[PDB]
């Protein structure tokens, strides 16, 4: 793999950053949105701060020409790209030749090096490392930070969180330079490698969801069906509502046994089994039951902050800001709280639905958020409250606009046998009201003027009548 040539570029980028830190220049940091990028960005930010330096961080979706030009107009002394930039080398090189740039990334590069000296490409791939299993974005950032100062080895777990988010251990175990980072984490006792269930949700999910949402690999006759999964755990004498971390080591082994036997009974290859049960990274730095205690669950948290326009908050968490974690918790729990509220409202106030000949229409106004309209509809159905043969529509005032109403329609298999098609019906009514609508036969959505709700109820019943 020629580690020494790679380590040479690492040192190149490490000393270059420290040079600007000692010059009192603000280190401009740019990192990718996912878990690999948020962890990578934090590792560099930690390094800068540990040296008494100063940084400004950005969490972006991708490197684009617009972005590079924005950055060039900031006229910074140094730009540090993290988990990004490898495909944008000549771009970066032309528009940022006036400044120092360090690229710490593992994606297949455009070129194997920058033509000028003040631009260094820190990347293991040109030296013979596999982009998807030998080291991740957080990993190369970790090498840089460790060269700057060995103390940054305490970010070893944060580095591995990125690796797992990037699925570097897709086969069930770690490889390449990742192994070195893990050993650093083992020496500082901030991470432990277990042999456990490699599924998501060992800290914050019920066992039956942990199994049903298993895709790598999939669990035959269980993946997809939560009810089948519930039945399965109860039959093997397990609490389907319990969380994996709440099991004893004794109970965990028997869970593994039942799953081993389950896979063998379906003829799964050894490789599939080794992906289901294998390396799981745990950190003593966090209490068991907390999503930060295991790497996959941590990465899932950070991916979430990335998609919620709060990537910099996810970075703060990796840095050790407990208050940031509280922000992230309330942020996620407030949504779960709205989903619960949505189902409460529609069931309690169900005595006020505009039942027509063919459909139920429920207007909730401001009471339910745009996005929760669909699950509200499903609630009325699943409660057995609504006639299963009769489609349900929930309507709520839109957050974006004000004169607008977003709506979603759901129904059943039984109803579809009457020839119903919510997508085609919502299409027709939308066009007539001057809005947008469409979707599948069993589920669809629509947006239209708030002042034509009575007209919608008429048109929607009529549109279903024709089918």
DSSP string, 277-336: EEEEEE-TTS-TTSTTSBHHHHHHHHHHHHHTT-HHHHHHHHHT-HHHHHHHHHHHHHHH
Backbone angles phi and psi of 58, in degrees to 5: -135, 130
| Helical residues (DSSP H) of 23-85, grouped into ranges | 35-50, 65-72
CA 111 to chain centre: 30
| Cα 96-106-290 angle, rounded to 5 deg | 115
Check the CA dihedral 91-94-97-98 and report its sign.
negative
DSSP 78: E
Range of the domain at 421: 343-466
Choose among 104, 98, 66: nearest CA to 86: 104
Check: CB of residue 281 under 8 Å from CB of residue 164. Answer: yes
Check: CB of residue 285 under 8 Å from CB of residue 294. Answer: no
CATH number of the domain where residue 85 is located: 3.90.1640.30
CA 348 to chain centre: 34
Full strand arrangement of the beta sheet holding 354-355: 354-355, 360-365, 392-397, 404-410, 443-449, 436-439
Check: CB of residue 138 under 8 Å from CB of residue 162. Answer: yes
Token digits for 317?
């968490």
Angle between helices 178-187 and 156-165 (to 10 degrees): 140
CATH number of the domain where residue 417 is located: 3.10.310.30
Q: Where are the beta strands (DSSP E) in 342-385?
A: 354-355, 360-365
Check: CB of residue 438 under 8 Å from CB of residue 421. Answer: no
Token digits for 147?
């060269």
Check: CB of residue 151 under 8 Å from CB of residue 184. Answer: no
Backbone angles phi and psi of 445, in degrees to 5: -140, 170
Token digits for 314?
């996810």
Check: CB of residue 3 under 8 Å from CB of residue 31. Answer: no
Cα–Cα distance measured from residue 162 to residue 32, given in angstroms and rounded to the nearest whole number: 11
What 3-state DSSP class applies to 269? coil
Cα–Cα distance measured from residue 288 to residue 450, given in angstroms and rounded to the nearest whole number: 48
Token digits for 240?
């389907």
Backbone angles phi and psi of 107, in degrees to 5: -75, 150
Place of tokens 């400004």: 56
Check: CB of residue 398 under 8 Å from CB of residue 407. Answer: no
Check: CB of residue 200 under 8 Å from CB of residue 165. Answer: no
DSSP 150: G
What 3-state DSSP class applies to 462? helix
What 3-state DSSP class applies to 125? helix
Torsion-angle region of residue 175: left (phi > 0), alpha (psi -120 to 50) or beta?
beta
Residue 463 to residues 272, 436, 441, 459, 460, Cα–Cα distance (Å): 49, 15, 13, 6, 5
| Cα 56-62-68 angle, rounded to 5 deg | 60
Check: CB of residue 306 under 8 Å from CB of residue 38. Answer: yes
Report the run of H or E that residue 427 belongs to, with start and end. helix 422-433
Token digits for 303?
């991916």
Q: Where are the beta strands (DSSP E) in 146-226?
A: 192-197
SS percent in the chain: helix, strand, coil, step 5? 50, 15, 35
- Our separate counts of H helices and E strands in the chain read 18, 13
What 3-state DSSP class applies to 31? strand
- Which residues are paired to 438 by β-bridges? 445
Place of tokens 């830190």: 21
């Amino acid at each position: 793999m020629d580690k020494e040539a790679f380590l040479e570029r690492v040192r190149e980028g490490a000393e270059l950053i420290k040079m600007h830190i000692e010059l009192g220049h603000t280190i401009r940091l740019i990192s990718h949105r996912d878990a690999d990028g948020i962890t990578a960005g934090a590792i560099l930010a930690k390094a800068v701060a540990r040296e008494g330096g100063t940084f400004q961080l950005s969490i972006v979706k991708q490197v684009s020409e617009e972005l590079i030009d924005q950055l060039a107009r900031e006229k910074r002394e140094i730009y540090v790209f993290s988990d990004l930039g490898s495909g944008s080398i000549e771009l970066i090189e032309e528009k940022l030749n006036f400044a120092t740039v360090v690229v710490a990334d593992h994606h297949p590069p455009e070129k194997d090096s920058f033509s000028t000296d003040s631009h260094v490409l820190v990347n293991p791939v040109p030296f013979g490392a596999n982009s998807v299993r030998d080291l991740s974005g957080s990993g190369v950032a970790y090498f840089v930070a460790r060269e700057m100062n060995r103390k940054n080895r305490d970010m070893a777990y944060v580095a591995i969180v990125g690796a797992v988010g990037d699925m570097q251990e897709i086969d069930g175990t770690f490889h390449g330079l990742n192994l070195e980072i893990i050993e650093d984490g083992k020496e500082l006792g901030i991470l432990e490698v277990r042999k456990e269930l490699r599924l998501f949700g060992r800290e914050s999910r019920p066992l039956y969801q942990m199994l049903a949402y298993a895709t790598n690999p999939e669990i035959p006759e269980i993946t997809g069906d939560e009810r089948k999964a519930i039945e399965w755990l109860r039959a093997k004498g397990f609490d389907p509502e319990m969380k994996y971390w709440q099991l004893r080591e004794e109970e965990k082994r028997k869970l593994h046994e039942a799953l081993l036997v389950h896979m063998i009974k379906h003829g799964a290859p050894k490789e599939a089994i080794d992906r289901l049960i294998g390396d799981v990274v745990i950190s003593p730095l966090y209490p068991e039951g907390d999503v930060r205690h295991e790497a996959r669950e941590f990465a899932t948290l950070l991916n979430a902050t990335g998609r919620l326009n709060a990537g910099t908050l996810g970075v703060a968490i990796c840095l050790g800001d407990e208050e940031a974690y509280k922000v992230a918790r309330k942020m996620l729990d407030d949504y779960k709280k709205e989903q619960i509220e949505a189902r409460k409202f529609i069931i309690q106030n169900w005595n006020m639905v505009e039942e027509g000949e063919h459909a139920y229409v429920f207007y909730a106004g401001k009471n339910i958020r745009d996005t929760l309209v669909g699950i509200a509809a499903n609630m009325a159905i699943n409660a057995g409250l609504a006639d299963p043969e009769k489609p349900v529509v929930v309507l709520a005032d839109s957050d974006e606009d004000e004169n607008l109403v977003k709506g979603s329609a759901r129904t059943t298999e039984k109803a579809l046998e009457k020839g119903y098609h919510l997508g085609e019906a919502l299409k027709e009514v939308a066009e007539k009201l001057g809005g947008e609508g469409g979707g599948h036969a069993i589920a669809a959505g629509i947006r239209f003027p708030k002042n034509r709700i009575d007209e919608f109820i008429k048109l929607f019943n009529e549109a279903l009548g024709r089918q």
